[PDB]
Design an enzyme around this catalytic site. Structure first.
Site, PDB file in Angstrom:
ATOM      1  N   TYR A 220       0.820  -1.217   0.000  1.00 14.33           N
ATOM      2  CA  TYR A 220       0.000   0.000   0.000  1.00 14.33           C
ATOM      3  C   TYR A 220       0.858   1.274   0.000  1.00 14.33           C
ATOM      4  O   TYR A 220       1.652   1.507   0.912  1.00 14.33           O
ATOM      5  CB  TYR A 220      -0.893  -0.024   1.235  1.00 14.33           C
ATOM      6  CG  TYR A 220      -1.951   1.045   1.353  1.00 14.33           C
ATOM      7  CD1 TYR A 220      -1.721   2.179   2.107  1.00 14.33           C
ATOM      8  CD2 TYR A 220      -3.196   0.907   0.726  1.00 14.33           C
ATOM      9  CE1 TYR A 220      -2.695   3.154   2.276  1.00 14.33           C
ATOM     10  CE2 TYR A 220      -4.200   1.877   0.888  1.00 14.33           C
ATOM     11  CZ  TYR A 220      -3.935   3.010   1.664  1.00 14.33           C
ATOM     12  OH  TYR A 220      -4.877   4.009   1.861  1.00 14.33           O
TER      13      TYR A 220
ATOM     14  N   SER B 233       1.815  -7.812   2.298  1.00 13.77           N
ATOM     15  CA  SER B 233       0.852  -6.896   2.891  1.00 13.77           C
ATOM     16  C   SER B 233      -0.310  -6.676   1.904  1.00 13.77           C
ATOM     17  O   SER B 233      -0.990  -7.639   1.576  1.00 13.77           O
ATOM     18  CB  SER B 233       1.536  -5.611   3.357  1.00 13.77           C
ATOM     19  OG  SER B 233       0.710  -4.915   4.293  1.00 13.77           O
ATOM     20  N   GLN B 234      -0.523  -5.468   1.388  1.00 16.23           N
ATOM     21  CA  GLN B 234      -1.517  -5.296   0.300  1.00 16.23           C
ATOM     22  C   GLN B 234      -1.276  -6.275  -0.838  1.00 16.23           C
ATOM     23  O   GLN B 234      -2.228  -6.839  -1.385  1.00 16.23           O
ATOM     24  CB  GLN B 234      -1.531  -3.877  -0.234  1.00 16.23           C
ATOM     25  CG  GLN B 234      -2.342  -3.663  -1.510  1.00 16.23           C
ATOM     26  CD  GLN B 234      -2.190  -2.251  -2.060  1.00 16.23           C
ATOM     27  OE1 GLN B 234      -1.186  -1.905  -2.723  1.00 16.23           O
ATOM     28  NE2 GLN B 234      -3.198  -1.444  -1.829  1.00 16.23           N
TER      29      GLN B 234
ATOM     30  N   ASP C  18       4.158  -7.676  14.431  1.00 23.80           N
ATOM     31  CA  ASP C  18       3.640  -6.905  13.308  1.00 23.80           C
ATOM     32  C   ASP C  18       2.424  -6.072  13.741  1.00 23.80           C
ATOM     33  O   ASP C  18       1.385  -6.603  14.115  1.00 23.80           O
ATOM     34  CB  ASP C  18       3.299  -7.830  12.121  1.00 23.80           C
ATOM     35  CG  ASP C  18       2.935  -7.072  10.854  1.00 23.80           C
ATOM     36  OD1 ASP C  18       2.383  -5.939  10.936  1.00 23.80           O
ATOM     37  OD2 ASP C  18       3.122  -7.543   9.712  1.00 23.80           O
TER      38      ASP C  18
ATOM     39  N   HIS D 138       6.382  -5.968  10.559  1.00 21.63           N
ATOM     40  CA  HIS D 138       5.915  -5.700   9.208  1.00 21.63           C
ATOM     41  C   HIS D 138       7.075  -5.249   8.330  1.00 21.63           C
ATOM     42  O   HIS D 138       7.278  -4.038   8.126  1.00 21.63           O
ATOM     43  CB  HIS D 138       4.831  -4.625   9.212  1.00 21.63           C
ATOM     44  CG  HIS D 138       3.915  -4.709   8.037  1.00 21.63           C
ATOM     45  ND1 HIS D 138       2.950  -5.685   7.924  1.00 21.63           N
ATOM     46  CD2 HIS D 138       3.811  -3.947   6.922  1.00 21.63           C
ATOM     47  CE1 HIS D 138       2.290  -5.521   6.791  1.00 21.63           C
ATOM     48  NE2 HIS D 138       2.789  -4.473   6.165  1.00 21.63           N
TER      49      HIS D 138
END
Ligand SMILES: [Cl-]
Ligand SMILES: [Cl-]
Ligand SMILES: [Cl-]
Ligand SMILES: [Cl-]
Ligand SMILES: [Cl-]
Ligand SMILES: [Cl-]
Ligand SMILES: [Mg+2]
Ligand SMILES: [Mg+2]
Ligand SMILES: [Mg+2]
Ligand SMILES: [Mg+2]
Ligand SMILES: [Mg+2]
Ligand SMILES: [Mg+2]
Lengths: 316, 316, 316, 316, 316, 316
Positions: B90, B180-181, B268, B297
């Site tokens: 993102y 992630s995204q 995370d 993360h």
């Protein structure tokens, strides 16, 4: 945001050298101490999930009989190959960057990622003679002979010696590269060895110490400040800064005789722009400084292109 | 430091599905809308400083007549080749990760880095129907038909359709990956298309929204909270959560029928472990979840090895 | 604390205009595109727990057929009334500031609080043509015609057109006001419309962009910096800054012909004092800048008195 | 993010009262001390830029012969009028909120913003008997007779006595309101005086001190902790907590017999939800508590509507 | 890191005095008000786990009939002894520093640690006439006669008067010392009393207020800024700064006629180097400023040696 | 604010010992290695500005032929004297705390402040065998024989052997003390030597490592976590934890058979209360634990009194 000298002043920033009168003799004697240790290189094959490359753990002996190691990755094809020695950031190696070394090999370079003694995998046999602030920056700082970066710089030279001795590497097509600490090691190695053909240094560390400790806003230059807090005699500060002067790449810079490519991010608070312009402006060789307004102490994608193009030109 | 459910509770965390009764029909109708737009792929060569690879800029048409693009790198050798569609984080693409795409090609994979509409290079033709909090997370959130991720998920499916249509790619050996995204898109792609043979998702985003907005300590799940602060009618919150449930990968995961490899770091704070375990535990397929106590993360070196070995096994 | 130019330098800070040669033509064509859309104003009465005022939801059509809305509050008595269009901060509207609009009406002004397309309630029909950094600041920034603030500025003009068309408002006694983004919109509206009789702008945003991105220490000017990080070509930066120049209120300022009252807090890190003095020093009209040493980017109670006194004088 | 008891536990949180056996007698005797000081109210007109209201500076004498003051705004029309006494936040009055007071008058209420002795404009004649941590929270905390809030609570009662004595105010329709410290004063006023008809308290401060000092994450409850660090005798802590128990609104709440409306944001780190629920749950009167998931210690727009509607209902 | 004027500019920084025309008369009248209060010193023996010293709680009466107290520790042997009055930091006394006082006595000095009225143990009988920002810095700041530091400075003088009256102290061998606030009190006491023989001030506070509020980056000088935020009239700021000028040690400095030893840390953000050089450069007496590059607002071990050597020389 | 186990659970927290089967033999063999190095103590007089004490720099030889040093201060009077060996905090000695050592001598104790090898003044001859995270915590952590604290603990034992050999010290009345790392060394010394008569440990470090790395919120326990991030093989973590178990004072505590006084602050984030309670609860000897609700990892005034009274009782 912007915090150091403005660009127009940076471009002309060239501090007087701080090299003591016995600077060259100290490096001569230091290289002579290195030469007394037989390298005894050892290659251990390593499994890695990629074709087109062969991976190894390379170990050799260096200054103070120290065991130094790292990942060595070679194109899986008939040599001789162009080669790269890659040096890492301060406290910034995570299991030796094996994946990056493999990628370098897949770009066609026999690549060794020297792991820094005491930081990651490699042994630091040098003692702590007098006590230091948390970190490596002030370990042995009261004497040039005992200072942490003496062994480190010599290891970096020995890495080149070892890699150039291999049948599968073209000794005439060897590059050095790295970022921050790895960038300082890049410049130091080219200053102390005839072996490298070209150098790419990302925002080099270990430069213009006198300015660094007054301008940096993050670690690790500020370890020096921490040491002076804990060891407050005026004479201790003078001695410590003298010691540092032997390792200051702005003082080694004039020895470099190969093409150099260098980066700096203008909001970098770890290796402040002034300190990097200082090293660059002391180079007398084919050189280029790539300046990035909106980047700090970090990966710069655009500079990665420049770096690849530069090594492709000089090493292939 | 640790903060989510303890490990023993994560392992059994399987929230009840929040999919509305018209979940499947929504997706079926959305895929039908995509199908009406002809892909019309266009490849443009790119001069890149590396041997062993050919680099292109790939552009195609997708949902809402949007122009989606990204780097496509291919092994410089006779195909057909195994392939990968790589999805990004993102607001986290810097000039499209061209270097990473090249590296994937040098590892033997015809690789396209799909760039997310409105974030990086790619066009988002979907309007902003009602006003949203800073970011994309709440763009169009009052209706499943207008929500930001509808077009994104469809672009991700269309990326696979396009790559699998190329002569030089082995349509039977196509992987999807991202973090992630990018991990959320990986799972969504495998759920909405039969094309992927295998999937590797780093700490996937867009999962278990109901818990995410209560447990996340960092952006960007918290944009949803920001939207609710700015649009405080109780009816608005219910409607927004229902919209989100159509895109929640824990609700899509039951469709994935290829091997899956997933990662999570226990500290995370962006994609909290519980949200990742929820997606994982809703998978019914060959699967593995690699848990890293000391990571958050971020890049996990040890997981890259697993990722490479996993694609080697399933695509080669 | 203090961080920008000292006051004596601020008072004389007047950067060269950055308006391209086709600046006026671009605004002319832009107003002409607005005029092609019929406003079709719609008023929906709204319950509100206060006597002496009538509240409405006002909606109209604007540039790109966009539905724009906001709270409109009128004194509950025979008109015609003096009026105010109030514009809000970036990402800073919480359900449209209904209570503030009611208070303006209770001070005797028919008041409309235009809600900014894509931010709060109002629709942004303009697409995302090329991808942008998180936020609205770089949406469509590669072309003046597509840039986010084109639609926004035109909406702000249309709001005046709509309010002036009402029987209960005295078209000759209309003011504009707002803070930060709302302050920029205030100056832009007075620059682009004959309708306003007076303007009060709190620390206006969207001014002296070239300096803003080098001096600001918080969001949202730094979104521009974030975009250049993610889209690193030199040509992209030149184009983006050219685009911004059409919307820079320091370039629109000379068009303003009504009395202007303006505020600045000397420790403001969002709209740095230099950027606000830049807009002010480019006004050639009856004007006053109220300077507050100990305030930043925030409500200034003393300036509220000044603002009320100023509108009472010019509008009653 | 969430941090106090979960909602289902807040709803039943009712700590045992900590009132000492002489609680009532303390307050009775304190009110008797107030009564000995003649109010001697003085009104001074103020030139304010608004129609429809008359603005004054109201001054009166209170406990300890202290001069207490604040803005008093009145509808510019024949009374008698409904009235409000508005109380302010800890260290949070900026020139007495004159604009807010005017707005209350324009909503139809004769309104006095009592300014807190020693914080803003008003005089604190009470000495500092023993030394205290930075702030007012521990001023005189070693004795109920000398404690800071004794005089404050009495001033708050005296504000109502004064306003209700005016010819233009309808003594039967007087409200009290305020947030945080102001909310605590609201509850204390309604508990110590029969004058208020209704009360609205935003996230009230000065409640459940025993829990507050263990759960609050921000100032100013933590001044108490600071005092204990600086004055570490165990006997001092017991005595300070007992002093505080005389002023704890959870111990006063059982006296309130008018309608009460209260707010709490679930992420409020200043006045933690549990402390607010404790005061609420100790009310035995017509009451309502509005809970806002996404808000903290801040302006809640939706609650202003409730506040206005509530005063409309009870005062008009 | 470094933030103020560079050292070479600091060494010559000597702002014009800000003393009003009635500065001397105000101090004369102030000392005369002190003299009207009989000291009535009271010594209460105290248990303490150390031999070679006798410890006491000393209490006396001062300006405004205020009860002032502190620990008094005496060598357990035949006098008369050299003596020290030690003054403490702002809000920085923890149960009166008894252990430090005992250590001073064990170094051979009869030592009293005056506790600051309203901060720790000692009573502040002066009222809060007009309301102030959180803290003591702006308490009574609208009038020299009511200002917080009037009573404090007079207490500091009275402490010397009391200690010098004791049979066991050699009235001719009395020193004063302290840090930050305690440093300001040290200079003020030597300026206002003939009693001290020598002074050691660590980074003194209450100096060059006009510069302090523009340069300091932490509390507590910024309380003055906070007060101006809350009390915004221009006349209030002028009055407040005039009041402060009577207490500014840079204005009292010329009265000091005894040897002075002073410290400053160049990264000190509480008492910025410029403000301390200002006081020092206004001393006309035997003096020395010890400058410490790598220290801020904190204990400096090297200066402790200097301080001990200085008092040993002048007091023994 | 509070964060570890609540008090009632701390009081019973007694983790199972983690000592390996060869724990005792390791320590026995380590003490045998120390014994082979002749102490060869050397005293050098130091000119210090105080009467009543004689100050020296004490140097001796220890484990690995390392030169360990520190200040030794002695009462200036006929002995033999009670004595103290004082140990310091991690990276927290500033020129060896000479002033504190003098103060201990003026309280009647012949006192040596042992300075920790490699941190302050003292020499660490142990190498860095394998590379470690920034700090000393993981230096040599892959083997009990090479681990940093092996040599440190032996130096601490040797400090006592040396002091107890002096003619002017009463060998039967020797204390040990220190905080955090110093407290851990205190407990380790009393466990590994019969020489100490009594021990006072402030919030001891090096305890219950397994919990420490999961609960600590500040450095330096978290260096261990940093090492695991950089060296991620599962076998490495197990080996490191086993190494640590040899030095964990909760495993040594069962050897201590002299009186012990210990402190803990309940908000201590460096040495979390649970880790301190674990060491305490593993003591079987005359013991006391002083718990301070409002204090963290810092100087606790009230505890100094307890410390002095405790040494008075046991050494005098
Ligand atoms: Cl060292
Ligand atoms: Cl939207
Ligand atoms: Cl865009
Ligand atoms: Cl007090
Ligand atoms: Cl005051
Ligand atoms: Cl090591
Ligand atoms: Mg192999
Ligand atoms: Mg060869
Ligand atoms: Mg109606
Ligand atoms: Mg009309
Ligand atoms: Mg006694
Ligand atoms: Mg006498």
């Amino acid at each position: 945001q912007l915090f150091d000298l403005p660009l127009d002043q940076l471009q002309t920033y060239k501090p007087e050298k701080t090299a003591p009168k016995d600077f060259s003799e100290f490096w001569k004697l230091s290289l002579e101490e290195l030469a007394k240790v037989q390298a005894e290189p050892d290659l251990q094959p390593v499994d890695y999930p990629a074709d087109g490359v062969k991976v190894y753990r390379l170990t050799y002996k260096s200054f103070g009989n120290a065991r130094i190691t790292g990942w060595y990755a070679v194109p899986d094809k008939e040599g001789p190959h162009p080669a790269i020695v890659k040096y890492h950031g301060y406290n910034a190696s995570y299991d030796g960057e094996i994946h990056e070394m493999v990628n370098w090999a897949l770009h066609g370079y026999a690549t060794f990622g020297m792991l820094v003694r005491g930081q990651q995998s490699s042994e630091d046999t040098s003692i702590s003679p007098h006590g230091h602030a948390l970190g490596w920056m002030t370990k042995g700082i009261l004497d040039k002979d005992t200072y942490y970066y003496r062994g480190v710089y010599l290891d970096a030279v020995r890495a080149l010696e070892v890699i150039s001795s291999f049948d599968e590497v073209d000794e005439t097509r060897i590059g050095v590269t790295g970022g921050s600490q790895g960038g300082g090691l890049t410049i130091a190695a080219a200053a102390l060895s005839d072996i490298p053909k070209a150098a790419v240094a990302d925002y080099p560390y270990l430069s213009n110490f006198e300015r660094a400790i007054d301008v940096a806003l993050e670690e690790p230059y500020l370890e020096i400040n921490s040491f002076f807090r804990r060891n407050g005699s005026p004479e201790t500060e003078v001695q410590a800064m003298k010691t540092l002067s032997y390792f200051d790449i702005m003082n080694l810079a004039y020895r470099v005789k190969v093409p150099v490519l260098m980066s700096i991010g203008l909001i970098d608070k770890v290796t402040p722009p002034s300190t990097v312009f200082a090293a660059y402006n002391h180079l007398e060789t084919k050189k280029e400084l790539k300046v990035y307004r909106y980047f700090g102490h970090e990966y710069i994608p655009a500079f990665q292109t420049e770096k690849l193009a530069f090594f492709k030109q000089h090493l292939k």
